[PDB]
Amino acid sequence: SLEAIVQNASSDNQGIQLSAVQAARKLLSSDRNPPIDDLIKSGILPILVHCLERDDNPSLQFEAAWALTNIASGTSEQTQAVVQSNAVPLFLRLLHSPHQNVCEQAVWALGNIIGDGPQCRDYVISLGVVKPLLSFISPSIPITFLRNVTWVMVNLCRHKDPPPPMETIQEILPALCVLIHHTDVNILVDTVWALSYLTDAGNEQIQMVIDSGIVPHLVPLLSHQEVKVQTAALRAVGNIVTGTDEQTQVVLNCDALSHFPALLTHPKEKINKEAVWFLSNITAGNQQQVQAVIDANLVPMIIHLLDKGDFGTQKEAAWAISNLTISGRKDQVAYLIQQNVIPPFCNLLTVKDAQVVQVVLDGLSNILKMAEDEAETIGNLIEECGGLEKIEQLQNHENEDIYKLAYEIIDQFFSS
């Protein structure tokens, strides 16, 4: 019973202590519904934390660390109970234990604490977790331990309110440059995910990632055999190309677009959608980057997904098409016209997602505005496929912006 366990764990006889701590650990690690609240209420947390101090009994440290790991794997309130009982400085102490298993379990427990959120993370960082954590990365580290270390690095990179301190990013990035060459799938997926959490953190973090020289090693992972690596890489480099034209161009200079045929045709619709999101962030750049997309023979695939894809991919393809018109030259838009973009583009005008309707109308407006002489021909194409009837109907749309733009388009181009 919990009462007896707590009593025996407070004991000064460490054989009885160990048996009781192991019984608590068993309650916490037998299934996926451990009674964390009951064990917290019983008052065991201070006892487990005290057990963490027993350098003379590594078994007790390990078992207590395991129990605390599992308590900390629960809700924010339960993780915080672990933090409130002063567990963190003692885990940091155990990071320098001579016994590997004590060290590993302390790393795991800290991973759960760090994962709870940015304020916990920043407490742990302020006490100096990063350098000891990274110090375990060496040729002899067991692969299971290294997987835990890399997951902890994910947790150090991922929260955004606020993001991790710049110093911490500067310490972590060289380790990620080391780990991106590992062939263990788990380590590689977690490495690329940590990178993606850095590249989603802002232009300055993106530039830190670029300056580290790692992007040339990241881009080829878009064609890794493991789809989990492929999608993690798609996220990391996609976040990069959400930034400036120059950062996007760093990505394009690693032959990124070469990897996309196998992603636009992937059987998984979610992958098509994510690839088309990436490409829409490319077509929103300057004329050279639009041309990069064109020269890679990707537009017909984008237009096919716009026509026949699932609605999420269709939405992302509508974005890619419309974004092309921001800085695209008349000849680039003309290429799109040649590729039968208008019928499926216009077919998207009757969907329920007002954002898609707006995107399509903005694109059509820019296309017509750009075409000086061909405006009449493009209008004839829009009418041919039923697009004009759809715009006319949109004049009665609920959304202010949509019906205003429908009026604008009709008046400026279909009122001769």
Partner: peptide, 26 residues
Amino acid sequence: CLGRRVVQPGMFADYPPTKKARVLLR
């Protein structure tokens, strides 16, 4: 409005867990 966009909801839903329990026999 047209332009670049950040990761959209529902994309990359298979993120690494924030927390992991150590389960005996798993």
